[PDB]
Amino acid sequence: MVVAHFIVGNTYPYTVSNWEEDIQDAIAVGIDGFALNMGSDAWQVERIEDAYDAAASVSSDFKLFISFDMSIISADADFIEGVVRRFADKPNQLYYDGKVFVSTFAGETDTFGYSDVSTGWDSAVKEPLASAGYPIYFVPSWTSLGQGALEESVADGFLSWNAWPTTDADMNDNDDIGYQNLANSLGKLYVAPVSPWFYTHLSYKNWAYKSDWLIIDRWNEMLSVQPDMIEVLTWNDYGESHYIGNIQGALPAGSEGYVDGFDHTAWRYLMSPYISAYKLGLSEPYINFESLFYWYRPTPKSATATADSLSYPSGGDYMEDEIFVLVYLLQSAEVTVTCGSTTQTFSGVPGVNQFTIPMETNASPSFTVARQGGTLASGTGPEIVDSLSIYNFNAYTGVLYF
């Protein structure tokens, strides 16, 4: 199964029709469900009610479950138990092994007054739910514990949050292999995270992670690791720039400058052959359609923001001043990428193709695919500029189907 992490905190304006659009968009690329990551605001429970009704209207197969964001919610066992029971009987609730699937972000230091985290989660949350007839399959994201997370007796599985390179290096999957190995020997579930990007630029968090080809490197790792389950980070965390859904709902204060106009449609559509291959157990993506995808940052990484109340983001120098072009082909084709005076024509071959050209500012990149001299696809991305009012290491993306 492949689900996407969903920020319920961004849904204050949502109606059911907003939920239906997200769920349709997720299904269209092969995503099976949403982890509904919720905070403490009472209106979030009402929006989650709408999420389950929307799921029922769209597809009986689409799965939903609660992720308690314990970085926001206090260790309130009554609240947690009550939310699990409120949605456990909905038709689209995800079950595993006959038990209610329940996840978290964090919570590894919450003991609910008990001597340790497993005694606390078990005595305050797990056993009360079991006694009421709702035993849960508890899959917290407790990455600060490392391999200790899977060793916690209260955990039935473990969702890692280690989705990004934290240095100048490419991503690697050593941790995923270790976690899946330990899940295998302990009889537990490992959920691996998959994220296309990272940029956050707010008064309380401000950094980038080396992204660039990350979405392809990570999906290649997933096809090799073959984790039990995958959670995509994220459908809609606008504040950290790894959203792959359509921008709707509410943007976190301070993020609008680097989110508005930065459509990430390409990042969800490009995942479909990798999701298919993951489900089929294949070592390479299952390519049965053709498409060009592109993405790039809006400025050179060295640009000095002209009116930013925040400082330059740590990690901004890690990325490359390049335009990224991904082409899925069933037959050979000629791919031309132009940005101002910078141009290159590439020989695309069947399968996955990865091309780059250097950024050039004050120009709008153009992309063409041709075959037997005839144009199959042509499009233009947003203009790259020398600087913006704020530091912006989010990416524009685009799709050209053909």
Side-chain angles (χ1 to χ4, degrees), residues 309-343:
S309 70
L310 303 178
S311 302
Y312 188 87
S314 148
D317 191 60
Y318 291 162
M319 293 203 236
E320 299 295 329
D321 283 346
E322 289 173 348
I323 293 161
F324 302 94
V325 181
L326 174 74
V327 196
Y328 298 160
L329 295 174
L330 299 162
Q331 311 163 217
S332 291
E334 262 208 349
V335 178
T336 299
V337 189
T338 300
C339 189
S341 78
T342 307
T343 187

Side-chain angles (χ1 to χ4, degrees), residues 93-398:
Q93 171 71 44
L94 174 66
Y95 280 74
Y96 183 100
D97 183 40
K99 297 165 167 182
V100 184
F101 202 97
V102 176
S103 194
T104 74
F105 179 83
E108 56 265 41
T109 63
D110 292 315
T111 68
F112 302 83
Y114 292 83
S115 47
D116 54 67
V117 54
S118 282
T119 301
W121 278 91
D122 185 71
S123 293
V125 174
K126 236 187 150 173
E127 185 84 354
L129 282 162
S131 313
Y134 302 97
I136 72 172
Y137 201 82
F138 188 50
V139 186
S141 184
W142 287 352
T143 309
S144 76
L145 301 183
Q147 292 188 354
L150 279 160
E151 302 270 15
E152 290 291 337
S153 63
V154 76
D156 305 298
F158 166 59
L159 162 63
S160 171
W161 215 254
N162 184 17
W164 308 269
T166 61
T167 69
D168 215 337
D170 281 359
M171 190 65 187
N172 75 85
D173 57 1
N174 273 25
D175 288 11
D176 303 274
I177 294 162
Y179 291 140
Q180 188 61 72
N181 274 337
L182 191 57
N184 286 349
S185 67
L186 288 173
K188 295 190 185 187
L189 190 73
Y190 174 54
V191 188
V194 174
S195 186
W197 205 266
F198 195 105
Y199 177 56
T200 199
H201 189 59
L202 304 172
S203 70
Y204 61 96
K205 53 181 184 183
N206 179 18
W207 71 89
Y209 287 140
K210 196 192 179 207
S211 301
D212 292 5
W213 284 121
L214 176 57
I215 193 50
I216 300 301
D217 294 335
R218 187 74 176 147
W219 266 115
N220 284 337
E221 290 168 357
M222 292 305 97
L223 297 190
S224 170
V225 171
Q226 300 187 319
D228 294 325
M229 186 168 169
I230 287 174
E231 184 162 318
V232 173
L233 315 183
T234 51
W235 197 253
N236 69 332
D237 191 347
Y238 306 121
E240 289 186 357
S241 300
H242 36 73
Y243 56 100
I244 68 168
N246 194 52
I247 297 164
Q248 46 173 352
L251 306 184
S255 72
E256 60 275 3
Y258 60 89
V259 175
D260 281 338
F262 286 80
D263 190 346
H264 285 179
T265 292
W267 288 351
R268 64 174 180 274
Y269 276 101
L270 70 83
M271 294 194 198
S272 179
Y274 289 94
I275 291 170
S276 290
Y278 168 66
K279 289 175 173 169
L280 291 163
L282 308 178
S283 60
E284 296 173 60
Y286 170 59
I287 303 278
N288 66 339
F289 70 92
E290 307 197 292
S291 274
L292 180 149
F293 310 87
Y294 61 84
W295 59 94
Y296 50 92
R297 282 180 296 100
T299 73
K301 64 183 164 178
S302 69
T304 301
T306 53
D308 201 338
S309 70
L310 303 178
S311 302
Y312 188 87
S314 148
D317 191 60
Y318 291 162
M319 293 203 236
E320 299 295 329
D321 283 346
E322 289 173 348
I323 293 161
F324 302 94
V325 181
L326 174 74
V327 196
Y328 298 160
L329 295 174
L330 299 162
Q331 311 163 217
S332 291
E334 262 208 349
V335 178
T336 299
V337 189
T338 300
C339 189
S341 78
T342 307
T343 187
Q344 190 165 353
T345 298
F346 305 88
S347 303
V349 303
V352 175
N353 298 259
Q354 290 169 263
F355 310 126
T356 66
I357 66 156
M359 282 182 179
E360 185 178 300
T361 61
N362 306 298
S364 310
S366 77
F367 313 86
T368 66
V369 183
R371 189 177 275 152
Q372 274 104 68
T375 293
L376 293 182
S378 181
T380 309
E383 182 180 36
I384 299 168
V385 296
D386 293 310
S387 74
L388 299 164
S389 297
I390 66 164
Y391 293 110
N392 189 343
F393 290 70
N394 195 4
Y396 293 118
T397 83

